[PDB]
Amino acid sequence: AARQQFVTSEVGRYGAIYTQLIRQNLLVEDSFRGKQCRVNLKLIPTGTGALLGSLTVLDGDSRLCAATKRAVAQVNSFPLPKDQPDVVEKLKNINLTVAPE
């Protein structure tokens, strides 16, 4: 695991538990790609997964930040693979940030 850099592989899970629950409400994709967007989820803890406490839009092409926001306001809960009060405090405050590559 090496422990010097591997947080870059954990962020590929930690923020994915949110983004994968969002896009599974609105399976659109084609108007979410090709442009860019950056928004920010701040969740509260709960026994089935985190819950929407606040959503900050920072920028994007409006067709994504308006759509995600409505999904995050209606999701059941975001299931995290961990359970430690150290890392429960990291996954609760993500930025969903997307662009071409």
Side-chain angles (χ1 to χ4, degrees):
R3 303 290 292 282
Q4 315 307 298
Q5 70 298 88
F6 91 103
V7 286
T8 201
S9 304
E10 288 280 44
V11 80
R13 305 201 284 187
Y14 275 45
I17 78 191
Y18 302 95
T19 208
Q20 291 299 333
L21 189 62
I22 270 65
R23 74 90 179 168
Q24 95 184 241
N25 297 294
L26 5 85
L27 47 58
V28 189
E29 306 188 284
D30 186 71
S31 61
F32 298 164
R33 77 195 302 263
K35 51 66 173 295
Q36 98 101 171
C37 183
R38 57 235 292 173
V39 307
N40 155 214
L41 275 61
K42 284 163 285 191
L43 304 322
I44 50 162
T46 274
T48 56
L51 243 56
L52 196 281
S54 288
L55 197 146
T56 291
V57 294
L58 182 59
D59 220 322
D61 171 77
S62 56
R63 187 59 185 85
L64 177 48
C65 63
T68 182
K69 177 207 294 183
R70 291 168 183 167
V72 204
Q74 66 81 72
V75 286
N76 190 96
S77 49
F78 311 102
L80 46 146
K82 311 305 183 71
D83 194 51
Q84 292 65 233
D86 187 277
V87 303
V88 169
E89 299 298 305
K90 274 52 166 283
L91 55 73
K92 56 159 44 172
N93 306 152
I94 62 281
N95 305 172
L96 304 182
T97 298
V98 308
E101 179 59 89

